[PDB]
């Protein structure tokens, strides 16, 4: 299962979403999106050791969305035919 | 205990106790003496 397609897709999705969140490509706990989709800083008051302001809640939600996108993609490719 | 007994003395609680007693008395009379139509023994 370690080299399987499902594990590779889940790991790639989770890593890509976490990396996008860390480098300011997603709304975060410390930056929030305008209705015109503009990211502006927000004082969440959450202490983190990451110098870019990446927090634990960011890890939780971005891993969740990575899992969700990977699972939907896996089930869609099994439905269509991989 | 005085305030609790004063609440039990309010009109709906007294009515509930009295009508429970009266309804129970009528029910148990009709249970012990079923179908009373006339005053005959």
């Amino acid at each position: 299962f370690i080299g399987s397609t499902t594990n590779l897709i889940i790991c790639s999705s989770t890593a890509i979403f976490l990396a996008a969140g860390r480098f300011g490509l997603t709304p975060s706990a410390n930056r929030l999106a305008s209705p015109g989709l503009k990211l502006s800083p927000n004082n969440s008051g959450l202490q983190t050791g990451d110098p870019a302001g990446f927090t634990a809640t960011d890890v939780l939600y971005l891993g969740t969305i990575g899992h969700v996108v990977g699972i939907g993609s896996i089930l869609g490719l099994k439905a269509i035919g991989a | 205990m005085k305030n609790f007994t004063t609440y039990l003395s309010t009109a709906p609680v007294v009515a509930l106790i009295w009508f429970t007693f009266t309804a129970g008395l009528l029910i148990e009379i009709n249970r012990f003496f079923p179908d009373p139509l006339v005053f005959s023994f």
Binding site: - | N3, F4, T6, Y7, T10
Partner: protein, 66 residues
């Protein structure tokens, strides 16, 4: 700003004193009846918490416990 638990400790004493006083919740009805309209008004206004007081906190606490 911050979502948190905030309560007040022991706001209302648990006692049967107001159980013995019908209409205690209302300023008009607490004086007792003069006519039989007071009997119906006591039941009609019993759960109108916003009529008893204008304080939104007391209304909300009454609604929660009800």
């Amino acid at each position: 700003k911050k979502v948190k638990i905030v309560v007040d400790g022991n706001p209302v004493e648990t006692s049967f004193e107001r159980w013995a006083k019908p209409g205690h919740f209302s300023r008009t009805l607490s004086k007792g009846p003069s006519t039989t309209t007071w009997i119906w008004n006591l039941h009609a206004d019993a759960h109108d918490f916003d009529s008893h007081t204008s304080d939104l906190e007391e209304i909300s606490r009454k609604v929660f416990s009800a």
